[PDB]
A paper describes a structure:
These two complex structures show different stoichiometries: a 2:1 complex for the methylated Norrin–Fz4CRD and a 2:2:2 stoichiometry for the Norrin–Fz4CRD–SOS complex, the architecture of which resembles a butterfly. To investigate the preference for complex formation in a 2:1 or 2:2 stoichiometry, we performed SEC-MALS and SAXS measurements in the absence of SOS. Both methods show Norrin interacts with Fz4CRD in a 2:2 stoichiometry. Lysine methylation of the Norrin–Fz4CRD complex was used to facilitate crystal lattice formation, and on close inspection of the structure we found Lys102 and Lys104, two residues which contribute to the Norrin–Fz4CRD interface, (see next section) are dimethylated in the uncomplexed subunit of the Norrin dimer, and contribute instead to a lattice contact. Thus although the methylated Norrin–Fz4CRD structure usefully provides high-resolution information for the ligand–receptor interface, the Norrin–Fz4CRD–SOS structure defines the overall architecture of the native complex. The Norrin–Fz4CRD binding interface is conserved between the complex structures.
Unlike Wnts which have promiscuous interactions with Fz receptors, Norrin specifically binds to Fz4CRD, but not to the 14 other CRDs of Fz and secreted Frizzled-related protein (sFRP) family members. Our crystallographic and solution studies further reveal that dimeric Norrin forms a complex with two copies of monomeric Fz4CRD.
Author numbering:
A (entry chain C), B (entry chain C): 43 to 164
C (entry chain A), D (entry chain B): 33 to 133
Write the structure that this text describes.
Amino acid sequence: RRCDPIRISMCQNLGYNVTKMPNLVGHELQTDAELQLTTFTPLIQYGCSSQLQFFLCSVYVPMCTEKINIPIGPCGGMCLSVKRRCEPVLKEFGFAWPESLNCSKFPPQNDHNHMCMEGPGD
Amino acid sequence: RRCDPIRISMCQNLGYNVTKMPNLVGHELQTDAELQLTTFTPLIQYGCSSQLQFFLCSVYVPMCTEKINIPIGPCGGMCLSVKRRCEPVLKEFGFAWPESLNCSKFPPQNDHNHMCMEGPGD
Amino acid sequence: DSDPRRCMRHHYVDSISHPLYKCSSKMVLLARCEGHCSQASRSEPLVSFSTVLKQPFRSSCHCCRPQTSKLKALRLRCSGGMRLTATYRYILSCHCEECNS
Amino acid sequence: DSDPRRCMRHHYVDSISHPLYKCSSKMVLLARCEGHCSQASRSEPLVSFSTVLKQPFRSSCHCCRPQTSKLKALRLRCSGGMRLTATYRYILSCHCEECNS
Ligand SMILES: *[C@@H]1O[C@H](CO)[C@@H](O)[C@H](O)[C@H]1NC(C)=O
Ligand SMILES: *[C@@H]1O[C@H](CO)[C@@H](O)[C@H](O)[C@H]1NC(C)=O
Ligand SMILES: [Cl-]
Ligand SMILES: [Cl-]
C-alpha cells in the first residue's frame, strides 16, 4: 500500500515498476514530472549518454520499494557520468546543466548507508 | 498481344513477368501447372538447391517474350545442377527424378542458337 | 512469395547490332541486375585536426550489381563479306556490394 | 515524404580526442545522412565492337549523401597553455545521389 505504479511512459520498463511522489525535484504529481521530463527529449535523442534516460527517470520518478521509507534515486557517480557527456551539448544550445540535477546532491555511491542506483563505469 | 501474365504465385518475381501456355511439360492452363508445382513444395522448403524454385518455374511457366515465337526455359546445365543436389533427396523419399525434367531435353547452354536461362556455376 | 524489391536477376531478349555499320542483327538472351539492397546507405563527417580537411566524409552504400557473368562473343555479318566480333556479358548472379569498393 | 526509413539527416554526438597532444576529450553534436533511396539500383551489360569501346556494364545506384554542408570548427582545451582546433563538415541537408557521379 506504499508504492504507486509508474504512469510516465518514457520511464517505464527501465528496471523498476513503482515510484512515489514527491520526487527528488519537488513535483507532487507524476503528471508534472512527465511534463518537465519532456524538456529533455532532444538530449536523449542525440545519444549524448546511454544512461541519460534512466538517470532522469530515477530523479523524476524515483524507485519506490515497500521495504523502506525513502525513495531510491541515482548515485552521484552516474550523474557525473551523464553530466560530463551531456552538459557540453546543453551549452551548445545556450543552456546550463540544471541546478536540480546537481550531482553533488546525490549519494556518492551505493552502499547500506545510502541506497542509490549506480550504472556502468564505461 | 503475344504473352500472358503469370498467375501462379510461387513463380512471380523471379526475373520475368509473362509466360505462355502450353508449357514445356504439356499443361495448357497455368492452373494445371500450379497444381503440379505444388508437389515440389517440400523439396523447395528443404533448401535442396537455391535454384530449384526458379528452375521448376522456368519449366512450368516458361519465360515468354513478344520478340520471338518460342518460350524460354532452363538450360541443361541448370537442370543438372539442381538435379545433382535434389535427386538424392527425392530418392530418400522413394521418388525418382521425374522424366518430365530430364536434363537432356533442355538446350545445353545459352547462345543465339537456342535461348535458355542459365544460372550460377556454384 | 518472393519480394519483388530484392536485388535480383531479370531476364530479357534484345538485339545485337552495330550502332553504325550496317549488319545482320542477332537475337540474344540477356540478364540484368535490379532491386533494393537491404543495407541503408549513409555518410558521416570525419573530424580533422590536420591541415584543412581531406576527404570530408566517410560513407557506405550498397548497389545491386552483377556478381558473376559469362563472357560471350559472337560474329555479325555486315555489308560485304566482312565479319565483326561483338563482346558482351551474360549475368549469372547479382549481389549487393559497396558503391566505391 | 514522412517515411522514417527515407534518406534523411540524423543527429548524434561523439567524443573527440587529439591523438598527438594531451587534451580534454570533447563532446560535439554531429549530423549524418542515412536511409534508403527510393530508386532501385541496377546494372545491364553493354556490347563492345572494334570501333565501340564500352565498359562491361552500365549501372545506376543511389546513395544517401550530404547535399549541403558547412565547415565547422572545434576548439580543444589542452595542456594549460594551448588550444588546438579540429574541423569537419556539419551536414545541413541530405539527398539521394548517383553512386559514381
Ligand atoms: C551545486 O552545484 C553548484 C555548481 O556545481 C555548486 O555551486 C554547489 O556547491 C552545489 N550544491 C551544493 C549544495 O553543494
Ligand atoms: C531421359 O533420361 C533418361 C535417363 O536420364 C534416358 O534414358 C533418356 O535417354 C533421356 N531422354 C532422352 C530423349 O535422351
Ligand atoms: Cl554513453
Ligand atoms: Cl545451392
